[PDB]
């Protein structure tokens, strides 16, 4: 907690004690690797929940999908060793990361026909049964999220390894909707206020009044941001949040921006986003009262690739709010084409 | 009318380099996206790269990361792609297409042929 | 990845018939964002449907695009000796793959 | 904002980008040196306010006094150069760091008989007039705080110099009660939440529920803690923060502790304090319902220096709340002598 | 009766060292604050240092910071002060008194005398 | 700093009179925390008032402590030949100086 840090913006050096906030969202986010707790508990947690009537698992953090993608070989073996007619298949993922309705629970009495080490060898493939248990994927038709579990896990208190390639996880003891507070951060030092976790980099600054400045997302979760890590979280109206509360928007007055209301129907379907306040290339925004009312976000390029040049806003504030993704440059809700349909 | 003419194709030794150019006319070149599409002999079509209007997106294919470079010049309606570290599987017909991976392609013109062998 | 599948691999017919094609989709394309391209041997590909239902400019009316959801069909009302070519189907968003369809050869 | 930080507790190295919160409250707090803005504005602000009827100035922070303690030679020169019948005499100050009822204001039309530099030499001693202007000190009888100004200054936005032995200061454009937000910070990273400034090191930690753990004060100010730098500041009751709101206590749920209410009558009159949760040496605390009700805090040593051994609390929570100052070990309100009167 | 006995005073060379001990009896030594008070010849009384019951406060005078050390032993009711880096003005009668700077002093006993010269 | 002042520096009287002292304070002592000590030359100091008003144990009745606020007076009702000594005044909290009072000499 004590060290010396150089500052490029101020051309100065900071030496002393305190708390430093790691980025963990740009420049090869590292590592948040995945080794869960004893597999016998998790393996036993499935069929008892499956007997209850669960059909699948959704993930809360984008990396958590990777843990399942490399654990089901172990899970399939242990349950088949207990002659359990079950099979597990994982899949890909894309925003918006949906959320289920129920979750797992112990039953801490685990299976008694398992080994102890997590790195066993001579893996043997299993068969397939009529009972198939799914995980997060493009399966929104056969089984909905109502019969799917979600936010069943939690980051272990001692399972924090930033250098050791492991983050231990245990299943929660109660139903919850908030995100995992064990890996989350928030700070402010006299010019900037950043709310950060494994996926979010919501950053706000002060020019004349405190307001949001930029945000970057490698994922779009659906868990509510806990109030224990929110700066200036009093008297905040939910109809003025720049980031919606349902998308883990922090409940704060630092999530404000004059002239803009909640972005309920922004380009959140993209997996990655980079929200800032500038102009899309080759576009101009003019403030006028006759422009159209706010609606869903519109891409700056049409279906033929042609660019839309002129835009208008009713009561926005320059510079306009725009999104950077893999699709181009999307504008905010309050920005509409000047004359194009 | 929209004619898209390209030049630069020819046989090259593996590990060499090459430069391809596209000539557009009859439409607002400085208003659309631009992309290069290659097609191996007798196989299906495949994207290579696409560039934005102001040259700020410039996304590339997975197998050509760090080897291919794309650029455009809206002043004289030209589109440029630079070949570097060519390998033997790059032998394909390269099409200059007026499109974008998240959109349909409207104009295609006379794709040039490049071969990488001895 | 919504990689598409084209069936059948090849089609055999005669002039004057009515041909049908199929471009299978992985799951639930968004807003019917699909297009059809004709590859005359050997020329640059053309564009037929926007759109999955809307004919492109300068295209004869016999080219009809249809289908919705995860199954799309391109059907030509009347066969014609020059129409024998290779047809590709592309999805444009979201998210599209890095390659076009396999293509179906139409043979006499 | 990017660097590598070594952590002794975790025995690991943290490298990345983000915000580092310097301690700047232990180990020779350095430096926050002293020079205000152009002297004519400050000099003109005295006699203009003296015409209104002001009589003295109070310092919101301990270090703000050291602004005056070394600048009073300078203003005496310019006012004499402007033939002003007034004198400036500063002195020592002690907690509680009292606050006046009004403040200074421009009048940005400054004196027209002054120089520009702030490091002039060749000081010439001046005389004394019948009109005397006081500064913060033990003068609570001749002139009350009603005719005394307070919180009239503000840290310049460009006034941040950590290696340069200077910190630019300017006068506020309006009356305010909150502390200086320009030099102010708060942060939290997954185990600890710290609110800090030049005088406060309020630190909270999580064992089972988030609660305050320790705090250190080199000053006891009277400006309200702004909510723009408060973590978890919603739904907080004003009768439950350990640090009172009047003494710059952060309005937050991290200022909570089960079994204890607000310490409105603690030994804050000491200049320096160290709040923690342990036992004073040689003392024992036993939970009992027949112990006396909470009152003023009591020093563990009597007027003869004898130690009081046994203590009782009605509905406290071990370990008991105790203070480290220059007087010994003071217990909280809810702790009373078991049998001593 | 509260008896306070001290020993160790004597003539020493400047820059030397010395140790002063206090012998307490007749009262609860392990219950009161302990302090040392010196008095220059013909001058007023001045605080030197004081120690808490559990030996955790141990405050020292401004002019002897880092030069003097104070300690106590409650088991045998003994109070110790350590002299180091003695200077010329340190010649004073040092009193072992039962007190504390923030309290009155109840018991004083026959403070010893120390001289720092050649 | 509440460094005290003792006036007068010395006092001259005769046995049978009634003397008074004065320990000026800088400002506003707290809870009347003042003490008086007797220094019979040459022995260890004694204790007279805790206390600023209350006689200490083992002290003759003639020693009377009074005063409040910022002025304190130690008055001996009955003079006595052995009472001629040096008296010091000390404030204990808060916050006391690092030195005792200057002392007042009582001379015949």
Residue numbers in the entry:
A (entry chain B), D (entry chain A): 1 to 341
B (entry chain G), E (entry chain E): 1 to 118
C (entry chain H), F (entry chain F): 1 to 108
What does the paper say about this structure?
NS1 is secreted alongside dengue virus particles during an infection. It is a multifunctional protein which exists in different oligomeric forms intracellularly and extracellularly, and they play distinctly different roles. The intracellular NS1 (iNS1), exists as a membrane associated dimeric form and is a part of the viral replication complex. The extracellular secreted NS1 (sNS1), exists in higher oligomeric forms. sNS1 likely causes vascular leakage symptoms in DHF/DSS via two pathways—indirectly, by stimulating the innate immune response through activation of complement and Toll-like receptors, and directly, by binding to endothelial cells causing endothelial hyperpermeability. sNS1 when bound directly to endothelial cells causes barrier dysfunction of the cell monolayer as demonstrated in an in vitro trans-endothelial electrical resistance (TEER) assay. Here we show by cryoEM that the recombinant sNS1 exists in multiple oligomeric states: the tetrameric (stable and loose conformation) and hexameric structures.
We also investigated the cryoEM structure of the recombinant sNS1 complexed with the Fab fragment of an anti-NS1 antibody 5E3. The 2D class averages of the boxed particles from the cryoEM micrographs suggest that, when bound by Fabs, most sNS1 particles become dimeric. The structure of the Fab 5E3:sNS1 dimer complex was determined to an overall resolution of 3.5 Å, as measured by gold standard FSC curve cutoff at 0.143. The sNS1 dimer:Fab complex has an overall arch shape, where the Fabs bind to both ends of the β-ladders of the sNS1 dimer and are tilted towards the β-roll side of the sNS1. Fab 5E3 interacts with the end of the β-ladder of NS1 via mainly the Fab heavy chain. The 5E3 epitope is similar to that in two other previously published Fab:NS1 dimer complexes,21—Fabs 2B7 and 1G5.3. We observed that these NS1 dimers have β-roll structures. This suggests that they are likely not derived from the stable tetramer which has an elongated β-sheet structure. Hence, they could be a broken down product of Fab binding to sNS1 loose tetramers (which contain β-roll structures) and perhaps also the hexamers. It suggests that the Fab 5E3 can readily dissociate the sNS1 loose tetrameric and hexameric structures.
